[PDB]
Structure formats: structure tokens, C-alpha cells
Amino acid sequence: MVLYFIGLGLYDERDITVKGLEIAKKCDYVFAEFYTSLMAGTTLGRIQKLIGKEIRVLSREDVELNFENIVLPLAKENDVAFLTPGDPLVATTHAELRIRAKRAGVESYVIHAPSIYSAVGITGLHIYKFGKSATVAYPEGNWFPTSYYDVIKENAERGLHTLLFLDIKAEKRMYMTANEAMELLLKVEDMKKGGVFTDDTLVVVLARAGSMNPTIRAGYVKDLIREDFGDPPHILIVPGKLHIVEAEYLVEIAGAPREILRVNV
Amino acid sequence: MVLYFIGLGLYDERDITVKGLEIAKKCDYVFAEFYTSLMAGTTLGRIQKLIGKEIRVLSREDVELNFENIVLPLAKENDVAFLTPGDPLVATTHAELRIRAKRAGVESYVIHAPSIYSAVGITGLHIYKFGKSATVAYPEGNWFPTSYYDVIKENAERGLHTLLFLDIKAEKRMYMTANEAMELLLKVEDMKKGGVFTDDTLVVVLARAGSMNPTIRAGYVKDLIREDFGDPPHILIVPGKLHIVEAEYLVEIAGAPREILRVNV
Ligand SMILES: Nc1ncnc2c1ncn2[C@@H]1O[C@H](CSCC[C@H](N)C(=O)O)[C@@H](O)[C@H]1O
Ligand code: NA
């Protein structure tokens, strides 16, 4: 009679909380999805071994179209868990799944876990200063989307930071690197020419947040565009004007050039 | 000879990640602060019991003025952990403490935990639609803070949601309720009269996120300003322009007036 939305956290199988683990262990059925994101620091096998339960993976369609025919029926006479990378309900369409549960007479509870939305605090950038967030999508065919560029513009204009999620093809396991995101943004700049993203723009790259050894690099596009940040997933941030304390952290921790202490403050 | 920043999570001791628990267990010394937030469902004893160590609790002054004199010296010869509610680097100034660590030749690692910043996802409001954040601070003497009012205005003009962290005076055991935040906001409106926060403004209250039954309520200020949302901590959110599914969730899950379903696109 109960459905548990449980977050898996950032990087590996140990990123789930103690509460999430113990609750999952007591569930009769455990489902998971890896289409909104993947756990690059672990495998399904390692997660299953840790939880001690067989885990049935669900595709995007399984969830978006048939959540009520696959997960909810079991939740009527059993304790069921639905695992997702990060913190539950962060992915835009997941909150609606709770309405589906209610509609079916099923109780649902949320067990939180670390999300990149909060984990980016490791970049030293004040989290109250982040503005609207966006996702950089690959152009294709006659389709060349650029809304994420306008997001950066509206945020930076008000001195706010822009968190940028990079395109991902979970099924094909293809990730968009920060390098690719930068090249794309430079391309969008040439078309819109709004003075939003150029070789002189300061950016921050966060990779493998949650791991014990994340990659945190900050610098100008002209110097980072071809730099190797390691294996995905990569997160890109376009800071607004910096707090001197933010800049100092970026210099001392993320290896940013001293130049930002005078140029971007 | 290392220093761990380890988040404890939202509500109780079980909100710590498995990674944080296992690392915290093997540390030689364990320090912690409980003034940046409130973990309503646990006690120091329960935390110590879970980690199996003696925890030395530090005050804001101990940290902000003497972190390098109390914590760092021990990190040079041992493995030290510094625990904090939620995520250690979110809406705190703890990030700067990593600079101090580095300058003392001490390596530091950050272990994230669920934060209120991402937990807002449980309100049904799209996480990427949040704009600049702010803190409703208690007036002191003749000093009446009001900047947070302007943040709401700026975000609202952009159709973005506003997350409002609520004040806390831990040494006086004072935790601002959403009710007090609303009262203070109406007073600021009377002063500025920008039509930003009135009896008719739709707001959302999230109380004790991290618990199994958090209080999630949405509605007009006039109706919620005196409602009892239970014990602290609370956060207040003034949504911007709503998507239909967001309104649907607020109505079905947060008990908002059915009339907000009719969004004025
Ligand atoms: N579980 C919870 N429920 C509701 N509000 C919470 C909360 N935890 C923190 N807050 C809010 O945030 C304020 C502390 S700000 C510090 C936040 C912390 N580092 C984190 O990552 O969550 C509180 O005064 C309160 O307004
Ligand atoms: Na945000």
C-alpha cells in the first residue's frame, strides 16, 4: 500500500542515504530508472548488491506512459520503491507521478538524496546567486534550439549564476562534454551576437560531483575549451559577477587564473 | 591527516549518505555545528550513537573565528570530520573554510547530503524554474532588512519561483516560521507598495522536509498567514508563473485552492 520515491545520490552506490537504504531493503519490489541520468561511479550490479534486492529497470516510456500499470498495481498490496539518480522529484516530470499514485489510492513518501542542484555548491559559488537553470541540447536536422543561451543572458544581466545541464543519451550512453557545450555556445553567440558567451567569458566546470575526487575547474573559455575534464558527467556553469570570496575560492580550489580577482569581481 | 566536510541531511541522523556514515565512522576526531540549520527529528546523542564517536559541537564564533585553531591543527596528524545539517556548502559560508584548510596545508573532501535547496522539488514546482534565492531575516533594533522583497519582485517579473530561506537564531533557539515570514513581508509591502506581496499572493510552505510526513501547503497569504504548519524548520516559496502540471500538483498534493488550476497564461 506504499510507494517510496528514493534518491540514489550523485556518483556511486554509497550516495544513497542511510534512510533510503534501510527503506529500500524492506520493500517487496524495487524499480529504478536511469534515463534522466546515470550513476557513472557505479553499476546496476553494485547497487543491487548493496540494497540486497533485485532491481527492475524501467525505461522512459515505462515511467511516463505506464507508471500506473507497472509500479502502482504492486504498491496496492506491497511496499514498493522507485529509485532515481540524485534527489527524487528533481526531474521535471517526476512530481506528477505522485498525483498518479494518489489517484490510484496509493500512499507515497519521498526519501531525499544529494542533487547536483545543491552539490554545485562545491564550486564555491553562492547558491542564492543561481538563477533560472537550463539544459544545453544538441542541434539536429533543421532544429537549432538556443533558449539556454537566453537563460544565461537574463541571469548574468542580473548578476546571477547559470547552472547548465548537458545533453545526454542515456540509452546510447552518449554524454555531451563541457568542451562540446562551450563550442556550441560559441556557435550560438556568432548567430545571436548578444555578447553573452565568448572566448573571454569565465566558466566553471564540475565533473563527477559526489565522487571522492571531483574535477572542479574555473577559467576563461579560450583556455578551457580544449582542456580535458575527464569522464562524464560534466556540468557547466556561467557565473555572474563574482563575490570576492567566490573568486578566491575559484582561484584557490578550482585553479582559476588570478586575473578573475580583478576582472570578474 | 585529512579533513572531511560531511553533510548530515534534512531531518534526522539517517539523512546522512552511506558514504558519509562509513567515512565519519573511521575518523579520529569529529566536530560539528548546528547553527546553520535545524534537524528537527534527531538529537546529538542519536548522531553520536550512529557514528559511534564523541562529537564536539562548535558555535558560530568557534567556526568563523577559530576554525583554524580548533579543527585544522588536528587535521594535520589525524583524519577529522566536520558535520553540518543538510549539505555543508549550501546557504552557509563554510566553503571559505576550505581555503583556510588549504592555506594550513590540510587536504579537504566534501561529502554531500540532501539539501533543502533541492528538496523543494517535493512542492511540485519545477526546480529549474527557481530564480535568485533570498533569506527573510528577523529585524533587530531599528534595522529592518528588506532586500529579500526585491528578489521576489525580480524573479516574479521573470515568471521565476523564489525560494526563501528563513532566519535562525540557534543560540536563542529561535526558528522563523513561514507565518512570521509572511507577516514581515506584508509589512515591507506596506512600505514599498510594489504589489509584490499581498493577501492575494499565492505562496507555498514546506516544513520539516526530510521527515516522512513533511507539511506541504500552498495557497493565498490571507488564508495561510495564520495556519499552523507544525514545528520548524520552514521555508517559504513565492511561485512565479505556473505550469499547468505545477498547479495540478499544488492542488492535489498541497491542498491549494482548485482555482489556481486556471492559470492566466
Ligand atoms: N528540512 C527542512 N525543512 C524546511 N526548511 C529547511 C529545512 N532544512 C533547512 N531549511 C531551511 O533553510 C534554513 C537553513 S539554511 C542552511 C541550509 C543547509 N546547508 C541545507 O543544505 O539545507 C532554515 O532556516 C530553513 O528555512
Ligand atoms: Na536553482
Side-chain angles (χ1 to χ4, degrees):
Chain A
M1 258 302 271
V2 175
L3 172 59
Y4 289 102
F5 286 84
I6 305 176
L8 284 183
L10 295 162
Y11 192 59
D12 54 58
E13 76 290 338
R14 296 196 295 160
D15 293 338
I16 184 178
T17 70
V18 170
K19 184 177 296 171
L21 175 57
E22 310 198 322
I23 291 184
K25 282 184 174 173
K26 105 196 343 180
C27 287
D28 304 292
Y29 294 98
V30 182
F31 298 85
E33 64 83 8
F34 295 108
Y35 69 78
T36 59
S37 171
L38 291 169
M39 310 289 294
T42 194
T43 64
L44 180 57
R46 294 178 176 176
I47 296 175
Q48 277 195 176
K49 174 57 188 300
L50 173 70
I51 296 180
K53 295 283 188 179
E54 56 175 304
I55 298 177
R56 180 182 167 185
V57 185
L58 301 176
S59 69
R60 175 187 288 286
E61 174 168 290
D62 287 338
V63 175
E64 310 190 322
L65 181 64
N66 300 307
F67 196 71
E68 57 265 56
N69 297 313
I70 297 174
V71 180
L72 303 188
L74 289 171
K76 270 280 235 213
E77 294 282 300
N78 304 288
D79 283 322
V80 179
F82 178 51
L83 314 176
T84 61
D87 194 17
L89 276 71
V90 160
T92 307
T93 61
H94 287 187
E96 194 255 334
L97 301 180
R98 294 198 75 197
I99 296 176
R100 295 199 207 184
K102 185 190 184 190
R103 291 287 172 61
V106 173
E107 284 184 306
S108 76
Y109 298 86
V110 180
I111 310 306
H112 299 282
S115 169
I116 190 65
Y117 260 108
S118 49
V120 293
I122 197 171
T123 63
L125 298 172
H126 303 328
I127 215 66
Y128 81 92
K129 288 179 66 183
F130 278 80
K132 183 178 186 178
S133 299
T135 300
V136 180
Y138 278 117
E140 55 187 304
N142 299 294
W143 203 243
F144 201 128
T146 58
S147 75
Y148 52 82
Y149 172 97
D150 300 316
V151 172
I152 302 174
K153 179 180 177 299
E154 294 305 306
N155 282 332
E157 192 174 301
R158 300 169 174 67
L160 303 176
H161 309 316
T162 299
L163 174 59
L164 298 168
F165 288 90
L166 308 186
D167 186 283
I168 176 180
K169 315 266 185 114
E171 265 172 306
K172 301 176 182 180
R173 275 182 160 60
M174 272 152 218
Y175 295 78
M176 176 195 272
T177 63
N179 307 82
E180 291 182 286
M182 288 183 243
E183 290 278 33
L184 231 193
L185 280 161
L186 284 180
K187 194 176 183 177
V188 178
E189 177 61 49
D190 190 52
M191 296 182 280
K192 294 197 171 185
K193 289 183 181 180
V196 180
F197 196 90
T198 77
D199 281 294
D200 298 314
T201 298
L202 168 60
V203 302
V204 177
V205 172
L206 178 55
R208 298 179 309 287
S211 94
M212 293 300 293
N213 292 294
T215 285
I216 315 173
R217 292 281 301 105
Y220 298 117
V221 178
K222 58 186 170 60
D223 298 301
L224 280 59
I225 193 165
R226 272 165 217 115
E227 186 179 327
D228 182 58
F229 305 110
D231 293 310
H234 293 168
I235 236 67
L236 181 68
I237 295 158
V238 184
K241 192 173 130 166
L242 291 178
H243 184 193
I244 183 58
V245 177
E246 291 180 309
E248 298 183 299
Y249 180 105
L250 289 184
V251 170
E252 308 290 316
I253 306 296
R258 296 172 304 184
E259 191 174 342
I260 69 170
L261 293 172
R262 59 169 179 284
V263 180
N264 310 92
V265 178
Chain B
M1 45 219 258
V2 60
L3 172 63
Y4 291 113
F5 291 93
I6 302 178
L8 287 188
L10 291 165
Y11 188 60
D12 56 66
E13 74 290 342
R14 298 200 300 161
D15 291 317
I16 181 173
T17 62
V18 173
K19 178 173 296 171
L21 180 58
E22 282 168 4
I23 289 176
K25 279 179 177 177
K26 304 276 99 290
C27 283
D28 301 305
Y29 293 99
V30 178
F31 296 90
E33 61 88 353
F34 291 99
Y35 65 78
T36 59
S37 186
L38 175 67
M39 289 186 75
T42 191
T43 64
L44 179 57
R46 290 178 180 167
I47 302 175
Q48 284 185 169
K49 184 179 181 182
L50 186 61
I51 299 169
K53 303 280 189 179
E54 221 114 349
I55 299 176
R56 181 179 172 185
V57 179
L58 303 179
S59 65
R60 180 183 290 283
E61 190 180 302
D62 292 315
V63 181
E64 284 176 31
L65 295 176
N66 295 115
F67 196 70
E68 59 270 56
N69 305 139
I70 298 173
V71 181
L72 299 195
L74 290 178
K76 288 252 47 152
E77 304 299 302
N78 309 297
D79 277 40
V80 188
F82 177 57
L83 324 181
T84 74
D87 178 296
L89 309 180
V90 176
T92 69
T93 49
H94 296 327
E96 181 268 331
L97 298 177
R98 297 197 70 198
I99 299 181
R100 303 191 197 184
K102 183 193 175 190
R103 294 181 181 176
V106 177
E107 282 288 298
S108 70
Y109 295 67
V110 179
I111 308 304
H112 302 289
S115 169
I116 183 67
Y117 196 65
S118 73
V120 301
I122 197 170
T123 62
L125 296 168
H126 299 338
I127 193 166
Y128 73 93
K129 287 177 64 179
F130 279 73
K132 186 179 188 180
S133 296
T135 299
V136 178
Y138 278 127
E140 13 181 54
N142 296 142
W143 184 264
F144 198 120
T146 69
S147 63
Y148 55 78
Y149 176 91
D150 302 322
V151 170
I152 296 172
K153 178 174 188 171
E154 178 181 291
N155 287 323
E157 281 175 8
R158 290 182 50 194
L160 301 174
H161 308 314
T162 306
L163 169 64
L164 298 168
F165 293 102
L166 303 195
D167 216 339
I168 171 179
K169 300 294 186 177
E171 280 179 356
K172 293 194 172 188
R173 290 179 180 174
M174 266 211 108
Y175 312 98
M176 185 182 283
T177 61
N179 305 83
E180 302 179 315
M182 290 187 242
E183 293 288 3
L184 286 169
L185 274 156
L186 290 173
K187 288 180 174 64
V188 181
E189 174 60 50
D190 271 3
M191 254 242 346
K192 298 180 180 297
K193 303 178 184 296
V196 180
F197 198 86
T198 75
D199 280 306
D200 297 303
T201 297
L202 174 71
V203 293
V204 177
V205 177
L206 175 54
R208 303 180 309 290
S211 71
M212 295 305 292
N213 289 297
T215 298
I216 311 169
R217 291 276 300 116
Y220 302 121
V221 169
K222 63 187 183 181
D223 294 308
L224 279 61
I225 191 166
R226 282 179 170 291
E227 194 180 322
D228 176 25
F229 302 113
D231 296 320
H234 298 183
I235 58 160
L236 181 63
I237 296 166
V238 179
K241 184 181 174 184
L242 299 170
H243 266 74
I244 300 296
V245 66
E246 287 182 314
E248 296 184 315
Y249 184 106
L250 291 182
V251 169
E252 292 293 326
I253 303 297
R258 280 217 124 68
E259 62 195 67
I260 71 162
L261 285 176
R262 297 190 296 290
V263 185
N264 292 306
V265 294

